[PDB]
């Protein structure tokens, strides 16, 4: 009589799928794997970089059944997407687990489809927690596992020995492009949150606190006479923000989040950016020696780089009582600079289109015209300006 993972994988593996995705741009096919969150609805979570720029998306279960499935939501700032199945019939869902209970030492079992071979299983342990910084921009609170992971494992499940989902594997570290004992997984509690935002809203309600900071090293705590060496130093407290409303001090260090210690700022930064605009969480502090825990709430944040589509140069909003778009932006040398968009000039619009707000512009710009020529007017001078 032996020990084995087979009894757990016997019931979990039908809840991991393969993903074959076709884009149209340059057109490509890409491989991957996913996780069935909801049985009836057919919500299959995957990586964002797996599924973007995709005309046709087909999902292949652990069975061998091929389905169709279009997108439900995406979020490339944390690398999670959601899709749902065409004709979802007799699926199996995974069980989520609390990623906030994991410790550096627990055993992990990875699932995915490396090199399109099919559903392969790997065993390992949680190598380390709260890994961030390998790509500085996006929200990273990666679980590090020595469970083997290679190309196509992305969106695959990382589950503990009961088969409950503790993470979605998203990255590796491979100088030759082959697993060398480092896998990276996004915790299920960040995943459950964004799968929960893509169902109700269709996109992600980018939450906003109202602070700034930077990673607390062991040097700052020496002179600042702070007790802890790893935390989040609140340099800037933004005014009139929900953060400041709680009495957040300037010069503090956040060290607690729901009574759970915090690894790094870029982890706490990541831990919070994965939340709905109306959630309520607690933070433990350390002002002068008193660990004052304060409740909080996040407050709102309409991006205009989605109106550029490759010619992004600067930030344009809405003016007054829709008198026009906005050009407060003053950028030089940008994709929107050789075309001479200087400060203090918006007008009506292009190709004989009345454009007085950001939405009225988006009505007709996205009719895809061959060439588009604005009408911007500086001071008294009514000019034009052409693109494409």
């Amino acid at each position: 009589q032996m020990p084995s993972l087979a009894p757990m994988l016997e019931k979990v593996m039908p809840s991991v799928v393969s993903i074959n995705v076709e884009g149209s741009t340059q057109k490509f096919m890409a491989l991957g794997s996913g996780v069935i969150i909801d049985a009836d609805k057919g919500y299959v979570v995957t990586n964002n970089h797996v599924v973007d720029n995709a005309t046709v998306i087909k999902v292949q279960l652990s069975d061998g059944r091929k389905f169709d499935a279009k997108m439900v939501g995406k979020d490339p700032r944390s690398d999670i997407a959601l899709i749902q199945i065409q004709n979802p019939k007799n699926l199996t869902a995974i069980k989520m687990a609390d990623s906030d209970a994991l410790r550096v030492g627990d055993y992990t079992v990875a699932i995915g489809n490396p090199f399109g071979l099919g559903e392969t299983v790997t065993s390992g342990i949680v190598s380390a927690l709260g890994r961030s910084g390998l790509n500085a921009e996006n929200y990273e609170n990666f679980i590090q596992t020595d469970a083997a992971i290679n190309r196509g494992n992305a969106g695959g499940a990382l589950v503990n020995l009961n088969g409950e989902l503790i993470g979605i594997n998203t990255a590796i570290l491979a100088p030759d492009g082959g697993n060398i004992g480092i896998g990276f997984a996004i915790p299920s509690n960040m995943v459950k949150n964004l799968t929960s935002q893509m169902v109700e809203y269709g996109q992600v309600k980018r939450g906003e606190l109202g602070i700034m900071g930077t990673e607390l090293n062991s040097e700052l705590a020496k002179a600042m006479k702070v007790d802890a060496q790893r935390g989040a130093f609140v340099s800037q407290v933004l005014p009139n923000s929900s953060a400041a409303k709680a009495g957040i001090k300037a010069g503090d260090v956040i060290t607690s989040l729901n009574g759970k210690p915090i690894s790094s700022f870029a982890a706490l930064r990541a831990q919070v950016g994965t939340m709905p605009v109306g959630s309520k969480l607690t933070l433990g502090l350390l002002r002068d020696g008193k660990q004052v825990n304060v409740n909080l709430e996040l407050q709102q944040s309409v991006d205009s780089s989605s109106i550029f589509n490759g010619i992004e140069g600067a930030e344009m909003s809405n003016k007054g009582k829709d008198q026009g778009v906005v050009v407060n932006n003053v950028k030089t040398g940008t994709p929107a600079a050789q075309i001479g968009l200087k400060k203090g000039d918006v007008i009506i619009g292009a190709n004989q289109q009345a454009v007085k707000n950001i939405a009225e512009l988006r009505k007709v710009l996205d009719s895809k015209p061959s060439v588009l020529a604005l009408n911007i007017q500086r001071g008294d001078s009514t000019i034009y300006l052409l693109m494409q």
Partner: peptide, 5 residues
Amino acid sequence: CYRKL
């Protein structure tokens, strides 16, 4: 670098 939160 500068960090926003």
